[PDB]
Amino acid sequence: SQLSFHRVDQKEITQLSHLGQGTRTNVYEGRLRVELRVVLKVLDPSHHDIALAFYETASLMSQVSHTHLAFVHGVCVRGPENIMVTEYVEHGPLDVWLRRERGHVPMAWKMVVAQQLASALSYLENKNLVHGNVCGRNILLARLGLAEGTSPFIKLSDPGVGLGALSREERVERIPWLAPECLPLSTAMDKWGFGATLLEICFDGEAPLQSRSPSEKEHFYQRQHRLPEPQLATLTSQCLTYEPTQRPSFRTILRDLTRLQ
Numbered sequence: 001s002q003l004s005f006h007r008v009d010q011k012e013i014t015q016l017s018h019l020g021q022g023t024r025t026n027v028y029e030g031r032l033r034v035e036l037r038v039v040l041k042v043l044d045p046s047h048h049d050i051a052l053a054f055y056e057t058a059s060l061m062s063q064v065s066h067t068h069l070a071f072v073h074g075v076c077v078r079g080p081e082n083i084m085v086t087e088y089v090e091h092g093p094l095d096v097w098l099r100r101e102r103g104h105v106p107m108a109w110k111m112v113v114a115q116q117l118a119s120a121l122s123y124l125e126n127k128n129l130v131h132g133n134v135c136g137r138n139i140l141l142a143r144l145g146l147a148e149g150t151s152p153f154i155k156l157s158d159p160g161v162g163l164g165a166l167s168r169e170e171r172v173e174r175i176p177w178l179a180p181e182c183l184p185l186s187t188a189m190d191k192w193g194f195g196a197t198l199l200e201i202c203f204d205g206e207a208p209l210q211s212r213s214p215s216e217k218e219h220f221y222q223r224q225h226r227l228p229e230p231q232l233a234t235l236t237s238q239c240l241t242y243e244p245t246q247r248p249s250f251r252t253i254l255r256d257l258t259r260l261q
């Protein structure tokens with residue numbers, strides 16, 4: 001093993017406006033010259049394992065292609081700062097967009113988005129690679145598709161700092177997207193995240209257990225409580241099965257989403 005990713009020189013990037021924060025990151029709009037519109041993910045000063053995890057994600061995402069996976073252009077080191085350089089996708093995070101468009105996103109639109117997500121994720125399953133952070137915030141909207149005769153187009157972004165390097169406190173915050181087996185490893189975890197993401201999508205960007213304290217989210221998992229029903233219901237319940245070996249394959253998930261729309 002030896003990572004593979006493009007090294008970007010600090011001269012080749014321009015840092016523009018702050019977009020928000022990811023896990024141990026600050027995220028900015030930028031420009032990449034040899035000019036590409038890009039996103040810059042500046043890793044906070046942090047333990048070395050966080051840094052290694054960041055690089056492991058850049059390497060992973062630098063070696064996969066898909067219609068519905070966002071590009072990773074490289075990594076730029078700017079003195080003590082490590083910066084992942086990624087695709088700017090026009091309309092930003094899906095969760096933010098859904099909350100703003102709450103009430104007038106039709107179920108048929110959500111079905112297309114779901115089918116796109118599933119096919120991205122079936123490709124990673126085929127490659128036996130784990131994403132580890134499927135949630136609406138990591139789904140970026142390239143086309144709105146709300147206009148008559150158009151259809152939406154999403155891209156799944158990089159998972160950022162790997163799950164294994166995060167604190168237990170951080171993993172709790174990711175409930176219900178976090179697979180229960182990860183609270184105390186496989187491609188199975190993304191079936192849970194997918195399920196949790198489908199609920200998030202069905203509820204116009206509100207995910208379940210958002211009004212719950214960390215202790216309550218933990219307790220929900222400990223008592224293996226069942227998450228609400230969106231009929232994507234069968235599918236979502238299948239994905240949101242605590243036992244990883246009972247979650248259906250993306251081949252099945254995708255075949256099912258097709259013969260639904």
Ligand SMILES: NC(=O)Nc1sc(-c2ccccc2)cc1C(N)=O
Nearest residue numbers: 019020021039086087088089092157
């Ligand atoms: N590749 C990638 O992740 N692109 C991202 S991340 C992001 C973002 C992240 C955290 C808070 C708010 C926005 C926006 C965009 C974008 N518009 O493409």
